[PDB]
Amino acid sequence: PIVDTGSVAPLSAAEKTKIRSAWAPVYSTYETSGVDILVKFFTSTPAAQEFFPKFKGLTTADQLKKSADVRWHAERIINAVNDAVASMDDTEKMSMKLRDLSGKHAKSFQVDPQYFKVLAAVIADTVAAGDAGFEKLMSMICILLRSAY
Amino acid sequence: PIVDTGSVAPLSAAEKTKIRSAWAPVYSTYETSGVDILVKFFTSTPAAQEFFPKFKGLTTADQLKKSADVRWHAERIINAVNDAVASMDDTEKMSMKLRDLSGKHAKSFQVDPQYFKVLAAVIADTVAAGDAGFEKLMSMICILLRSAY
Ligand code: HEM
Numbered sequence: 001p002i003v004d005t006g007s008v009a010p011l012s013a014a015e016k017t018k019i020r021s022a023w024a025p026v027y028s029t030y031e032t033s034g035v036d037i038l039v040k041f042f043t044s045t046p047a048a049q050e051f052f053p054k055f056k057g058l059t060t061a062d063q064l065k066k067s068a069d070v071r072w073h074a075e076r077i078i079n080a081v082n083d084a085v086a087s088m089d090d091t092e093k094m095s096m097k098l099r100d101l102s103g104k105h106a107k108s109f110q111v112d113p114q115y116f117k118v119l120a121a122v123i124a125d126t127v128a129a130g131d132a133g134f135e136k137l138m139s140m141i142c143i144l145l146r147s148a149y
Numbered sequence: 150p151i152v153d154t155g156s157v158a159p160l161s162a163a164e165k166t167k168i169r170s171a172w173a174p175v176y177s178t179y180e181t182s183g184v185d186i187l188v189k190f191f192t193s194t195p196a197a198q199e200f201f202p203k204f205k206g207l208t209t210a211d212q213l214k215k216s217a218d219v220r221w222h223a224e225r226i227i228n229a230v231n232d233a234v235a236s237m238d239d240t241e242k243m244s245m246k247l248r249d250l251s252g253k254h255a256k257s258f259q260v261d262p263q264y265f266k267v268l269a270a271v272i273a274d275t276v277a278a279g280d281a282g283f284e285k286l287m288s289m290i291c292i293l294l295r296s297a298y
């Protein structure tokens with residue numbers, strides 16, 4: 001399961017390879033994947049909706065997929081994950097970028113840190129449901145995303 | 150015409166209104182608009198191509214529209230303009246964000262500052278060809294984008 005506290009063991013060359021494979025297809029059409037992942041997370045997790053101000057009024061999954069605000073937010077989130085995937089070999093660069101992002105979530109967007117893993121899970125199901133390796137990569141991302149809180 | 154030096158007169162309430170109108174449709178489907186604007190700029194301005202490292206190998210306009218790298222870069226650029234459009238009433242906020250962006254272009258991406266206006270022109274043709282008001286908004290953006298150089 002995905003964790004957002006403590007530490008997780010490094011990624012093995014084997015795990016990185018599977019991740020890159022499962023990711024390629026999804027990121028290949030990130031504009032669609034991203035929106036589905038975000039629309040899914042948003043609709044099924046009511047408690048977290050108050051944190052998407054620009055989505056006020058939107059409710060049906062159909063309205064969301066059409067809002068340019070939703071698409072932009074999804075494209076940015078989905079590309080952040082991609083940056084992480086592209087940096088599995090430079091864990092130092094991966095950290096700097098995410099810690100920076102952590103700060104923005106805590107100081108500006110003011111989002112409750114508990115949902116990072118909830119959304120991470122949706123991304124995991126969609127990309128490679130069941131793969132522990134990918135779950136490990138999402139854990140690193142969640143742990144770093146909470147580093148500024 | 151669009152300028153990237155000196156200063157330009159403030160935007161009148163009348164100009165801001167036309168801008169918001171011409172922009173709404175374009176930004177409404179920014180993922181497509183952005184890619185066309187960028188693909189157009191890139192293909193017709195060979196001299197500036199060396200500054201898009203992630204596009205090495207890409208040549209036909211068809212290849213570009215399919216690359217995820219091109220789409221992401223276009224979506225980011227097109228949204229930067231949108232941020233500016235959304236801030237015409239808070240020229241102070243508009244400056245901070247752009248100056249920051251100026252620094253990135255000069256210190257990291259290392260892009261030749263002369264093309265800002267060339268691309269700004271393509272964005273102007275597409276959005277509201279001929280409108281001086283919109284050209285004024287693009288000038289503010291180019292002047293600020295060169296402030297770090
Ligand atoms: C793996 C999880 C997540 C990733 C990788 C992620 C990534 C990002 C990225 C890259 C941005 C763009 C920031 C910028 O424009 O500078 C962003 C913005 C934002 N994120 Fe997160 N995010 C995550 C989870 C969440 C969650 C769970 C929430 C809400 C419960 C959230 C709420 C926001 C908000 C409110 C913004 C600001 C959007 C705006 O006003 O334009 N994020 N996030």
Ligand code: HEM
Nearest residue numbers: 197200201222225226229230258260261264265268269290
């Ligand atoms: C109105 C004009 C322009 C705007 C508003 C604009 C906006 C942006 C934005 C918002 C980014 C994202 C930066 C980030 O990821 O933090 C960016 C990246 C970039 N821009 Fe500009 N840009 C403009 C013109 C240009 C021009 C003319 C060139 C090249 C001749 C250029 C080359 C780059 C490069 C190389 C990147 C880095 C892309 C990457 O490696 O991910 N930009 N620009």
